[PDB]
Design an enzyme around this catalytic site. Structure first.
Site, PDB file in Angstrom:
ATOM      1  N   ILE A 123     -21.104 -67.101 -21.570  1.00  0.00           N
ATOM      2  CA  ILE A 123     -22.163 -66.454 -20.811  1.00  0.00           C
ATOM      3  C   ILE A 123     -23.507 -66.634 -21.512  1.00  0.00           C
ATOM      4  O   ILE A 123     -24.504 -66.989 -20.883  1.00  0.00           O
ATOM      5  CB  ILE A 123     -21.851 -64.956 -20.635  1.00  0.00           C
ATOM      6  N   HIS A 124     -23.533 -66.408 -22.818  1.00  0.00           N
ATOM      7  CA  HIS A 124     -24.763 -66.556 -23.581  1.00  0.00           C
ATOM      8  C   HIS A 124     -25.307 -67.985 -23.556  1.00  0.00           C
ATOM      9  O   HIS A 124     -26.514 -68.197 -23.442  1.00  0.00           O
ATOM     10  CB  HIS A 124     -24.538 -66.130 -25.031  1.00  0.00           C
ATOM     11  N   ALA A 125     -24.415 -68.964 -23.674  1.00  0.00           N
ATOM     12  CA  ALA A 125     -24.809 -70.369 -23.670  1.00  0.00           C
ATOM     13  C   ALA A 125     -25.306 -70.786 -22.290  1.00  0.00           C
ATOM     14  O   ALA A 125     -26.195 -71.624 -22.166  1.00  0.00           O
ATOM     15  CB  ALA A 125     -23.631 -71.239 -24.087  1.00  0.00           C
TER      16      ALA A 125
END
Lengths: 191, 190, 193, 191
Positions: free
Chosen positions: B25-27
């Site tokens: 999700i962060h990437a």
């Protein structure tokens, strides 16, 4: 096919070459959403095309971006570099209190004056490129500013779309190496 | 930020995989793929076994390969990409398949014990699945995150329905950053 | 309605054939977003179950006025009656006592008054949850559910249960949803009445 | 908790009651992607608030938008209308050569000059509202311009952000009745 459809759902005003660049960006992102969200300066295409045509150094903020530029016509007369692991980068990063990405951009630009800046990851690398260009008056250098992040990324790209710098970016939170690299590769067809 | 991501993830996703999901999700820089992330019950176990014991991590593109940097992973595993191998162009032309697909086939023929990481080409994911199903190599897990449209959706749909251990993202979304972050995420457990 | 239709058709997997391809195309067009195309899901018996209900004349129960207002297909309204009990004054009372939301209370009540129904959820996950509960407890599996609630974690979790149940349905995986989508799906059946 | 999540996506510069409104619109759309894509003029909040507080006519382009406005404080002092089905709509659409929505907007506005425009669907409705305003000089009228579509939607809202009309909109293709209605309901808390 899919891509054959995108090509008709793009701002009719976006003429010729850029439409191709926009399609490539949409595909790399697998998201039409960014079509109406792409922003660029009137002279971006020309500025970019000139550099890639004559042959220059393409400065990337990350290895994934560097590795993503494979267009044969582009790599013909242009060299792609990433200074993230440069000895002088880490040294200056620690010293000056700036991210290693930002430091890489600074060292790279000092090493190669005739360049194109491609940001596909760090907002700080985008801000550093803008700083370098402005404080040195190197407006011949265009910027593909597609950093990732949320509010930090948006704030960084908001400045881009306000400067005297030629560029291409994406409104919103979308960004990333695939998009950044595809924009560069898209120019291969006009070289 | 990281506080908002973890809240977007269904509280039921517990264990090491919750860490993998937050990295993805962060990437991806987008909370939308959070409920679209999918994986088999045996994926974590299948992946850790391979990465722990050391194998070849086969990538469909250089971007995915350049994105895998976790030291614990790289110390025990070799990350490769045969896209630009000279044998791939030849095989792709002879068989009328894409270069990415040819690279996966060459790579898997050269390295039996592997983990497949797809961050770009739907045809690459399709070829990896074909190799596994035609040879019965179900020991091989797949990080299937190709980007695209109908082509990508359908290939990933096939993945989710197969008997292959995997992780994927439903829909059009995908990409190297996500694919690479998932592999990096395992470094912590090696 | 334009080259859009063509554009949308290319975004929908060829696997989707028959009348449902038309309904799916309308859902995507109403959402004005190609992104949900691969996210639409529905049971094999959804189309037959829905067409049966709408062809024979039933009561279309909605979780909000927006959905109700969005349903205008003449063929549909000529045979079916669309309702919404979010406001029935038995709702608030029930919501308090049972400890549920008013949307849910509205559904339960609406279903008790009309058993021969079709359920259309375009907003509240709790409404979707309540409809499913009513169906699985009374075994009214003849009732199809257009479960398109909106929201984040709550909406997704509610729709995952739907796609995993014995209920005939159509839904959108993920966070995306809305009354425009839910209503367009019902309007789509009009063409087959 | 989803509130905190949302709020974390909103750019800090968005302060005041408008932050509450932006939060409501994102939640109604179930998509954090629009958070950085919401745009509004400096005078929009005050203008909208004053009209709704004073009690005016809320002109909607579709029935779904009208049905979506349920805030009691709003309904107690404002009339919500939609002229899509008015007879004069088709009769004017024909003679003037515009769509039904556009026609409804025009008739609605001629019937009620003191209004607030809420567009949750048709691009031609937004275009018509802007046209009426610019032609008559009715710049006192604010617009919630959130049409939906692929091509025409994004372009129509583009002109909105660059006009002299007070407004709130969403850049790109994303729009719709749920978002438009939520924005209006959001003001109830301040009346």
């Amino acid at each position: 096919r899919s891509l054959a459809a995108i090509d008709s759902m793009i701002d009719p005003d976006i003429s010729g070459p850029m439409r191709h660049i926009v399609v490539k960006a949409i595909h790399a992102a697998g998201d039409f959403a960014i079509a109406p969200l792409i922003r660029y300066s009137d002279g971006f295409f020309k500025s970019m095309l000139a550099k890639l045509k004559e042959g220059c150094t393409i400065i990337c903020d990350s290895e994934m971006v560097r590795a993503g530029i494979y267009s044969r016509p582009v790599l013909e007369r242009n060299r792609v570099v990433c200074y993230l692991n440069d000895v002088r980068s880490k040294e200056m990063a620690d010293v000056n209190g700036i991210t290693r990405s930002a430091a890489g951009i600074r060292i790279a630009m000092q090493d190669h004056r005739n360049s194109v800046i491609v940001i596909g990851n760090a907002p700080t690398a985008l801000l550093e490129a803008m700083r370098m260009i402005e404080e040195n008056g190197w407006y011949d250098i265009p910027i593909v500013g597609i950093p990732v992040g949320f509010i930090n990324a948006s704030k960084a790209k908001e400045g881009l779309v306000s400067s005297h710098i030629e560029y291409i970016s994406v409104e919103g939170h979308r960004g990333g190496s695939p998009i950044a690299a595809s924009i560069v590769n898209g120019f291969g067809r006009f070289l």
